[PDB]
Every structure is written in structure tokens, then in C-alpha cells.
Symmetry: D2
Subunit: 329 residues, 4 copies
């Protein structure tokens, strides 16, 4: 007799608690919490662990989600600065890092973020030797390359959020113009998560109907190219208006964790090793259409690129090697 | 003082209950309940009304869903043989009708189902003058034509479930072979909901990549045509094994009610008036890619059909006119 | 022939777009977007309208949600400073207003927020004469009183978010201690959304088992009273750590919009007219357990309060009248 | 070069597919598919395996769900008569067995179902040594006892669906009368899943308000006892109208699998070992309020039963021992 002793009986038998679908969101900032509320809301994990160097912020964000437990189906929300909190995660999502000030390219953030990465990746792997690492930080393509190097994980367990967002942005504008739910519109953005992103004009379709063979001049005149245009600009506009981007990437990331936690084998433009494809010579990471499952990237989809697109992918891959080349370890 | 008087107070103010997103599923059979449990589960309507001539069956099915209210977010489930139960529905889904015995074509059901239709459509319209009618009964293409004629509703408020299912079936097999979630696979089935269904080989794609320009011989050799093959066969197999088809169409229908109840403007292969498209001369109904909203079909998507497909659509449209022609009113 | 003309056909028939389940979130701040992302995610409305005086912030938040359309089932997201944007809303959620600086009581915000209210309520009612107004702003109890007065709407269409959050907070701590999902724990917080909130010790239960008759001393010794304690403190902690509260109220609000948009008739502690209950003499608003539907508060639940609780409710109602009394119109 | 070779590339790295949240529904009948469509729809497992002795029926049901993959988030649906198909399930739900003909008590099914059980339990455990077994078959209380004996699994990994349904049925009728969503109504049914079920009159509440102290005579006069009445009758009515019960138990079961697959620790009336509680002397299984997690029953909730209820539980436990006693192994 205590309250709990008087209410709660026990059977002869029982075993230690254990969570089997754990996800760790590293970084409890704008993007941080956006990914975290998305996942919570999609009941993707039975456990969510937040990690951040900022200790007050972490605990308040933790607390704030915990007060909402009644309204969820995620049995455990934990948090701490010590990476021990993240042990046995199936997915580790990284969000730590400086962000773009307005007008600053994502590429300008490489040194700042490499330096954070160099501290975070050892501990991650330390505590979850078999996880899948999902980088979101910018410059996301370069950072997925770093994370892979520093980590030594099989290439397939390292993914960048990459162009999933870009392609989402593209298909929303397509939708806006054709007057069709973005989900019914099919168009792909690959290459860098940034200013040198390639738009696959010859893949664009609504119900398998090629926009290119209907228009022809698509790749160029009628300001259809503006769609690509608004796509590269979009991060910059949102930043100047709002200050940062949060909610689109939370969703874009949750989409990705779903395919993974459900072993769904869906095609998503994310960041991978592009070496040996389309004549690329180096260890460069960029988005291509990838098949994802519960163990990472299952397969890459080989795109039959037109001459100009293929030329665009080449450039993309180039602006990024000139950056990796000079990465000091 | 009564139980309720002692517990439940009242404010000075209040107004009559009223439901604003009502859906009536007419027919409480296999397909009946499949559509009904799908919708319930997607919280699409604030009210669900079932109607059937079979009075014991209706009330038990009603009862059975009602006992599950705690586990739902649909405030009202009602039922009755008198079409008064369905008044002010935003969507009316018809499921009443004989079904295929094994080996029987859907076309063989026309007389049986016309005769039911002739009793059901007047009352429907009677009680919900502004609804959207969704036919599911077979032969679904012919029945959406009947329903339209007998009803006199603006063509856009009359839809057949049509090829939404067929195309779902197609993309599942595509998925099975490429090793990609059916949702990432894009392929379209149009024409009749049946044996003369046209498969658009030149629309087939994964990430905007045309399977046709990669293969070429697609429309013919390598048994890729078998996919189309298994698609026409599928209803017949399921029937001989199981006796009928239920769960695939429930889902296919819910998908459709969603786009409608959410005014989402998504593209779905459903049955419409094909007159004046692809050289079709008559008042024939078949599936084409349609844009749907909260008021019905918003727009048709004009497909750039290849010579053989276009020839297939023509045949389809023909096997069906020879049937409508002879419909006695 | 244009792109769209070549792709998109038309039937003989069609009708004007119109949305039928519209919700307007007034205020695109922390709480603002939390309520807005919750609702979006629960597919509660076919249309979401944001309104704010801050024009850059509004448009960027609008834009940011729009870029996420593919990942939702809400056909329309709109925004503007002119209340015309909100016309024909079924629900209007108000979030505009100063917020607590750390250590500041919610009561200190009355003058600031009355002054905003005096500008916002006329236009709301102007544009949606039949809506349901949901106040969230603080001090929420006083503001639902203002909104009602200035508006002249039937008392039942005016609701405060009130103690739904408080009671959520209570049941999370209960859960934490008994070792039971907060949803399986039943405990109620009523009275002011603030420091004088009454906790109904004699309603507390897990599976209809009264914690009070098991403990007895519950209302006082064993620090069970600390639960109430942490509940009043909670807003203040989160504020000092994080700066404001957002995510718990977004969820708490969505829960409320659900019951409404689904005509579910669920019991929620929200703010109403308490006049004539428990000896209250004045036009005071506080949370009591209310039945909600698609037209507002359907019914109040009469609580059989114990002598001390009833005494607590009285005090609560008193600290709030001393404040309404002096409201200058 | 093959289709797939031309489209699908490979990284240097990759690992064997594996599913980590597997559920096996044994029995592809009415109840069978109801549980299976519920779970599918709640994205509870990354893999669903159906097992049945009836081979045509199994494969067609399998096929029928597979054709609906596009419309789900469950990567794998499998099926087979050989229990090898079920290896490494986290949850095994048993549905195999005769069902009640109208007017037949659940108790009459014991011999028929024991005999099936004796074949099924060895293979289950054979193939998934660490699973959680969920019995649904009738008489469910007796069958969870059998399953435990024959299996030798730690008592906590064996659960009966039990009174979760009964209590759902109770709270729907409560709701019907008070005019409150069944979820806001709290009332508990324990004891046998059948004719001797005990209703806890003294636990009944809406917002922690005791219906008993408001009424007093509750346990007896005013036909409030009819609610209990309709609860025991309900299975029998549905059977005579419809032929069997399916959809309520599918949902009731999914609710249960959720708490389990999400390690939510929620309280559910299910079947357990009641030995040593309320003076029960024997190895009897009946529903009591239990805390469930990812490893089974975590804890029992000790109810403070009134004298008559406690007397009811005793009887219940007795009608069931007289049946177990004589079970021939
Ligand atoms: N790839 C995409 O689509 C995309 C989209 C938007 C934003 N981003 C990027 O996301 C990152 C975060 O953006 P933000 O707006 O949330 O920034 P922000 O100001 O919120 O900073 C994020 C956080 O990272 C933390 N952090 C710093 N060093 C840390 C360390 N050693 N360990 C753990 N956490 C640490 C900070 O304490 C803070 O919580 C930036 O790199 C930004 O460029 C990427
Ligand atoms: N288009 C599709 O994709 C598709 C898929 C499968 C099944 N179907 C069709 O669905 C229809 C029903 O199939 P089923 O398997 O459920 O058949 P079924 O045996 O269950 O018959 C359906 C029901 O319709 C009722 N009905 C008969 N006349 C009625 C009337 N006047 N008013 C109301 N209800 C009445 C019956 O009482 C019964 O409840 C059949 O036409 C079948 O061919 C269509
Ligand atoms: N009741 C609850 O549970 C609860 C919980 C938390 C916060 N709140 C309250 O929510 C309100 C907003 O809190 P916050 O943290 O989001 O504050 P905040 O700083 O974000 O301010 C909210 C916004 O209101 C806008 N606003 C100001 N005047 C306006 C006008 N005339 N028309 C429209 N919008 C106008 C501002 O531009 C800003 O967008 C505060 O009153 C806070 O106390 C209530
Ligand atoms: N506990 C509850 O709440 C509850 C509710 C309703 C129904 N039930 C029970 O569910 C059980 C099934 O009911 P039903 O209506 O679906 O019956 P049913 O006719 O559909 O029979 C179910 C199935 O079990 C299969 N089966 C028989 N022996 C088998 C074996 N050795 N291995 C595997 N499968 C085998 C049959 O082939 C068939 O697929 C019955 O015991 C019924 O009483 C329980």
C-alpha cells in the first residue's frame, strides 16, 4: 500500500521495457522541431530523442512536446546533451548548424558546419553503430559527403534530404499552373540542393502525358523555365520574409522517414554517391532518384538524361567537387 | 432532476443540429461496407447514411458500425429503406446491383442493374437535388450513362468509379516488377471498366523517365503487355477464389470521395462523357483523366494518344455504344 | 492551343468553385502557425485563411505552407490583411495579441488585447455572420467575454480554448506517475485559464476507479496537490526556457476544431457563460465541461462539486469578475 | 541492359531486406480480414502475414489486399499455409475457429476450438519464439488459457481481446443516452467475454463525475442496468441479423495492436491470469484493466470493487473454471 501499489498489480511474469523504432533528431531549432512534430504526428517512431548543445532550449522543447502526449501515439520523448540519449536509434536526423542569413548561399556554411559535424558524427555512430544517418544541414550535399567520410558507414546508410523539397516546390508550382493537385503532377529536380539544381524537363508529366512533346519548347521559352527559376529562388524569398525555412523541410523529412520506417521502397530525390554515373569521376554527393527502405538506399534509378540536362548535372557535380576537394580533415 | 437534467445544463442560446458533409452509401453489400468502412476511417463525412431494400441486413450493418463509434470521428451513422434518410447528401455512392458470377462479364449485368437504377435514381435526386452521384455498380460505364439520363443532372455531377481501380492494379504490378512502391510508378488505364480497357504505354514512367523510350518494344514484346493482361483478368481471378471483389474498390472509392470532400483537384481516371473527344460521335461514358473537386468533375485532361492506343480507345467506346444504343427507357 | 488548352478539356457542364468547411486562423505567430499546422495535418478544413496585420510575415508563412501542398489534403491556403479573405468561415480562431513576458501573469495582458479585439471582432462577424469564434488569446477567459459582448453572437458560438490544455497538462503528469498513457487517465481542470484554476480531485480516475476513495487525503497530502501546482507553473517554466508556448496549444486547439468540424459531441473543458451555475451572479466566462458540435456548445455538463472545489470555482469566478467589471467599451 | 538493369543502378554498398514490426493474422475469415484491414489502415506493421488452412481463400484475400498497395504504407503482404510465413512476428493474432450459430453461446465452441488450437500454437511459437500472442477466437477467455498452457510463454505475452469490445459497446450506449461521444464516456466491463460479464457501476463517469453518486440506484432501477443488458445481447442480435460480427472486433483489435506496436502503456480490459486477485483460487483468465506495452501486459490495475460487483466477478470466474477444469490435454 502506496497509491500505485494499491492500484497496480503485477503478473508472475514481465520483461524490460525496450523501444524498437527509435529516431533521434539532433538539433532542436526551427528545422529541428519541424521535423520532430512532423514525425510525432505520423506515428513513425515509438521513441523520439532530441539532442542539442543548448540545454535550456532542449529541455523546454522536450517539455512542450511531452505536455502534448495525450494528443499523440509516441510512448517516449527524451532529451539530453549526452549522446547516450540516442543509443539504438534506427534513424538519426541531423539538423545542427548555422543557417543562411538573407542572401547567403548554402555553400558559404561549409566551414561552420564541417566543424560541428567533426564533433557530432563520432558520438552518433558511437551510440548507434547500425543507424541510418539522414543529413538535413546545409550545405546538405557537401555535409552528407562529410558525414560519410568521417563516419565510415556503408554508403547506403547515409542520405541527404537533398532535392525531395526542391521537387516538392517544383510540383506545387506545376500544380498552381495546370490546376492539378501537386501530387498528380510529376516533375523532378536533381543535382545540388541549391543554385545548380537540374530540372528534368523531359520527365514532366500529368497522367503519363509528356509536357515536353505537347510543348517542345518547354526547356526554354514561355517562362516554363521560370518554374525552375522560382524553385532556386524560393529558399531566398522565404528567408527574407520569414527569416528561415522550417515547415516545408519538416514535412519533406517526415516523408523520407516514413518510406524508411515502413520499408516502402518509394522513389525520392535524395543525396547519394554519384560517382561513376553520367561520367562523374569523383566522390561527389547530389540527389538522384533513389529507392529507400528500412536499411537505407536500396537502389538508384538510372535516368535517361537529355543532352542539356545531362550537361546541367555535370556542372552541378562540378561546382560541388571544387568545394569537397578542399575539405580539410 | 432526471439523470440527464442533473448532469447536462443549457446556455441561454443554441441551434438545431445539422450535418454539413453528408455521404450516402446506397447498397449495404460487400462493396457496400468496403466503401463505408474506408470513408469512416478517413473521416470524410460528418454523417453516413446507408440505404438498402434488405431491411435486416441494413440495420445489423448499421448497428455493427455504430458499436464502433468510440473508435471513429463520424458523429452520425443512420440507415433506412426510405430515401428520406439520405436527404442533403453532398455525395451519393451507388452500390446496389447484381454482381458477376464467375466467368460472367460485367456487360451481362446491364438489364438487371438498369431495372434497379430505374427505381433508385428518382428518389436520390428527389432527396438531394444538388448531390454528386458516384456510380460503382456494374457495368459501371453503362450505369453512369443511365444514371445521367434518368437523372438530368449536369454531366459534371455524375461520375463512374471507372478505371481508378484498374490503374491502381496496373501500378501495383509495375511496382512488383521495378521494385518500387506503386505510388512512385505512373501508368494509366482508360476506356471501359472492363475487358476493352486501354493501357497508355507511352505515359508509363518512374520519376518522369519514360519506360517506352527506354524499351521501345514496350507496347508489345517482353510480356510487358502481360501487365495489361493481368489487369483485365484480375477481377475474374479474385471472383473465382474469393467470390467477389470488395476491399480494393472500397479504397479506390474512398480515394475518390476524398478528392471530392477536400476540393483537392486531383487527376483520377473515372467515367465521363467522352463525346467529341478522339473522334467519338456518341453519348458514350468511359474513363479519361479527370480533375475532381467538391462540385464534381472540374476538368478533363486531354491525352496525346499514340496511334494504337487511340485505336484502342475507339474500339472500347464502340463495344459500349452497341450496348447503350439498345437501352430501353 | 496554349499548354493548358491542349491538355485540359471541358464538359458541357460545370459550376463555380466554393469551399464548404473553411477555418480562419487570425494571427500568424507562434501559437498562430501551431494551430494552423495542427489543423492542416488533421485535414479538418477544405480551406485555410490566415489574417495578420504584419504583411511580410503573413505572406511568407502562407508561402511556406503552400510549398507543402503536395504533402497535405487541403485544397486552398489563402492570406491577406483585409478580412474579406475570411468570408464564410465556419470557424474563426483568434490568436492575435501580446504574450506573457516571463513572470507576467496572463491578466496583465487585458488592456493590450482588448484594444486589438475592439478592431478585429467587427470585421470577423462582418465577413462571416454565422461563424463560430474560438478565442485563444490571453487572458483567454476575459477575451472570450469581450468577443461576446462586442460581437452580439448567440453565446453558444463563442468559445475560449480555456482549460482543455490545462486538463491535458494535468493528465500527462497523472500518466507520468501512475505509468499510464495520459488518455487512460481522467482528471479535470476548470475555472480560469490561469493561476486560479480548480482541479476536481473527486473526478480523478483510471478505468472508473476513483483515486480519491483509494487515497482520501488526495485533495491535500502526499504532494498529489503538486500536480495542480506544476500545472499552474507549467506556462511560466516553458516561457522562461523557450520564450513562449506554441505546440501544446496548437494541438489542444486542433482537438477542439475536430469535435466541431466533425459534429462529434465530445466533452471539453472550454470557456463559457457560467452565470447561474454554482451560485455565480455575474456574466463571467470560465471553463466548465461542455458538449461541442458543429454549431458550437451544445450543452454544459453539471458537475457535482465537493465543498472545497466549489469554493475554489467561486474564488476563480471572483478574481475574473473584478477584472471584467472595469472593462471600458 | 534488361529493363530493370537500364533503370536501376546500385551503390557500392547494401544489405538484406528485413522487416522489423511484423504482425501475423492467423485466420482469413470475417473477423480475420476485419482485424487485417484495420491494422493495414493504421500503418501498425511493416509486414503483414496471413495464415489459413483454406488455400484458395487465403491467396485471394492476399491478392485483394495487394491490389490495394498503392493506397497503403505497408511494404509487404504475404500469405501461406506453412507457418514459416509468420517467422519473427512481434504480434500473432489468432482468429481461426468455429463461430456462434445464432443462439449458441460462445462456451459451446470450446472443444472445436481447443482441437484447432492444439495444432496452431506449437507452430506459432515454433516460428516466432519471442512473439506476443493475441487470442480473438471464442470462447476467447478459455482460449487464452489454452494458448498459454500449450505454449509455455511468460504469462504476460498472452492476451485475450476480452472485454475491450464489451466496454466499447457499453460506452457507445452510455454516449447514446447522455448525448456524448462514447470516448468522453468512461464505463468498464470486466469478467468473461460473454454472458457473465461484470459492469463496474461505481467507475462510471463523464469528466470524473460519478454517475453513481448522482443516481445512487444506478446498479439497479431506471433500466440503466439495461445498458449491461444490451451489451450481453449485442453479439446475439448482430448474429441473427447479419450472421456474424466482424467490424467492431477488427477495430477493437487494432486499438490493442496500436498500444502494443507503439509501447503506449494504455489501460485496456483484456484477458489475463486473475489468480490471486479478488479471492480467485484457480488459474482463470478473464478481463481486468491492464497496462500494455511493446512486450505485452506491463501491469494490472487493481480495482476497488463494490460488494455486488466483486460478487459478480466471482461468479464470472466460477462459470469459467468449471469449464477449464475439464480441459483434456
Ligand atoms: N536541407 C534543407 O532542405 C534545409 C532546409 C532548411 C534549413 N536547413 C539547414 O538546417 C540547419 C539548421 O537550420 P535552422 O534554421 O534550424 O538553424 P538554427 O539557428 O535553429 O540552428 C539549429 C540548432 O543547431 C544547434 N547546434 C549547434 N551546434 C550544435 C552541436 N554541436 N550539437 C547539436 N546541436 C548543435 C543549435 O543549438 C540550434 O539548436 C541549417 O544548416 C540550415 O541551413 C536545411
Ligand atoms: N466498378 C467496380 O470497380 C466494381 C467492383 C466490384 C463490384 N462492383 C459491383 O458492385 C455491385 C454490388 O456488388 P456486390 O458484390 O456488393 O453485390 P451484392 O450481392 O452484395 O449486392 C449488393 C446489394 O445491393 C442491394 N440492392 C438490390 N436492389 C436494391 C435496391 N433497389 N435498392 C438498394 N439496394 C438494392 C442488395 O440488397 C445488396 O445489399 C455489383 O454491380 C458489382 O458488379 C463494381
Ligand atoms: N490560451 C492559451 O492556451 C494560450 C497559450 C499560449 C499563448 N496564448 C496567447 O496567444 C496570443 C499570441 O501568442 P504568441 O506567442 O503567438 O504571440 P506573438 O508575438 O506571436 O503575437 C501574435 C501575433 O498577433 C498579431 N497581431 C497583433 N495585432 C493584430 C491585429 N490587429 N490583427 C491581427 N493580428 C494581430 C501579430 O502581428 C503577431 O502575428 C497571446 O495572447 C498569448 O498570451 C494563449
Ligand atoms: N472475441 C471476440 O470479440 C470475437 C468477436 C467475433 C468473433 N469471434 C470469434 O472469431 C472466430 C472466427 O470467427 P469468424 O466469424 O471469422 O469465423 P469463420 O467462419 O470465418 O472461420 C474463420 C476461419 O478460421 C479458419 N481456420 C479453421 N481451422 C484453421 C486452422 N487449423 N488454421 C488456421 N485457420 C483455420 C477457417 O479456414 C476460416 O478462414 C470464432 O471463434 C468467433 O467466435 C471472436
Amino acid at each position: 500500500a502506496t497509491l500505485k501499489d494499491k492500484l497496480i498489480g503485477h503478473l508472475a511474469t514481465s520483461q524490460e521495457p525496450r523501444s524498437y523504432n527509435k529516431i533521434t533528431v539532433v538539433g532542436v531549432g526551427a528545422v529541428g522541431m519541424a521535423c520532430a512534430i512532423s514525425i510525432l504526428m505520423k506515428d513513425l517512431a515509438d521513441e523520439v530523442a532530441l539532442v542539442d548543445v543548448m540545454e535550456d532550449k532542449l529541455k523546454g522543447e522536450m517539455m512542450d512536446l511531452q505536455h502534448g502526449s495525450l494528443f499523440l501515439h509516441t510512448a517516449k520523448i527524451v532529451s539530453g546533451k549526452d549522446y547516450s540519449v540516442s543509443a539504438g536509434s534506427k534513424l538519426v536526423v541531423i539538423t545542427a548548424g548555422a543557417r543562411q542569413q538573407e542572401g547567403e548561399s548554402r555553400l558559404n556554411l561549409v566551414q561552420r558546419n564541417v566543424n560541428i559535424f567533426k564533433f557530432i558524427i563520432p558520438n552518433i555512430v558511437k551510440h548507434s553503430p547500425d543507424c541510418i544517418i539522414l543529413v538535413v544541414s546545409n550545405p546538405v550535399d557537401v555535409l552528407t559527403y562529410v558525414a560519410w567520410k568521417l563516419s565510415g558507414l556503408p554508403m547506403h546508410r547515409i542520405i541527404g534530404s537533398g532535392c525531395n523539397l526542391d521537387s516538392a516546390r517544383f510540383r506545387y508550382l506545376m500544380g498552381e499552373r495546370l490546376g492539378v493537385h501537386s501530387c498528380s503532377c510529376h516533375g523532378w529536380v536533381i543535382g545540388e540542393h541549391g543554385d545548380s539544381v537540374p530540372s528534368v524537363w523531359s520527365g514532366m508529366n500529368v497522367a503519363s502525358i509528356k509536357l515536353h512533346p505537347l510543348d517542345g519548347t518547354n526547356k526554354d521559352k514561355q517562362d516554363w523555365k521560370k518554374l525552375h527559376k522560382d524553385v532556386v529562388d524560393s529558399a531566398y524569398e522565404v528567408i527574407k520574409l520569414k527569416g528561415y525555412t522550417s515547415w516545408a523541410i519538416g514535412l519533406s523529412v517526415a516523408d523520407l522517414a516514413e518510406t524508411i520506417m515502413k520499408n516502402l521502397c518509394r522513389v525520392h530525390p535524395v543525396s547519394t554517391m554519384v560517382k561513376d554515373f553520367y561520367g562523374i569521376k569523383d566522390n561527389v554527393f547530389l540527389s538522384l532518384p533513389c529507392v529507400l527502405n528500412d536499411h537505407g538506399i536500396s537502389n538508384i534509378v538510372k535516368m535517361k538524361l537529355k543532352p542539356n540536362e545531362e550537361q546541367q548535372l555535370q556542372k552541378s557535380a562540378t561546382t560541388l567537387w571544387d568545394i569537397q576537394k578542399d575539405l580539410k580533415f
